[PDB]
Amino acid sequence: KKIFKPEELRQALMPTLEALYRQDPESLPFRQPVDPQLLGIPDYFDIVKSPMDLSTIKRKLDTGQYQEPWQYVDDIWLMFNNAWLYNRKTSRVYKYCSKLSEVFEQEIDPVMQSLG
Numbered sequence: 001k002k003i004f005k006p007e008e009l010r011q012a013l014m015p016t017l018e019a020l021y022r023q024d025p026e027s028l029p030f031r032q033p034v035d036p037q038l039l040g041i042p043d044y045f046d047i048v049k050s051p052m053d054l055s056t057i058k059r060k061l062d063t064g065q066y067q068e069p070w071q072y073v074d075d076i077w078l079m080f081n082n083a084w085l086y087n088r089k090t091s092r093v094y095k096y097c098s099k100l101s102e103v104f105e106q107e108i109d110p111v112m113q114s115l116g
């Protein structure tokens with residue numbers, strides 16, 4: 001039941017988020033919230049009830065919204081799962097999502113062993 005200072009959480013986790021955000025071009029579809037009206041996908045919020053993206057996660061990390069590291073990890077998988085759920089497996093975004101998830105696994109694994 002260890003408690004982490006918000007600042008130490010940000011320090012430990014931010015490099016993993018940076019690694020995802022910097023991944024080009026695979027991060028591009030995940031750098032901002034999905035905007036259904038712009039994209040012409042009006043059923044999006046019927047399928048995805050809990051939208052998530054890298055900018056939102058970044059904000060949560062900056063503003064003390066995570067009490068413990070698994071909450072960050074939860075949001076990352078929420079983001080990936082939303083994309084795997086909504087998009088066809090052949091789609092560009094699905095494929096980018098999978099590649100990003102592999103980057104995430106490599107970066108996160110040592111951090112979370114070293115943390116919680």
Ligand SMILES: CCc1c(C(=O)NCc2cccc(Cl)c2)[nH]c(C)c1C(C)=O
Pocket residue numbers: 028029030034039041044082083086087092093
């Ligand atoms: C298909 C819509 C979508 C995007 C997206 O941003 N597309 C536009 C785009 C902009 C730049 C680069 C690319 Cl490749 C696509 N993003 C997500 C998570 C999704 C979904 C539904 O899951």
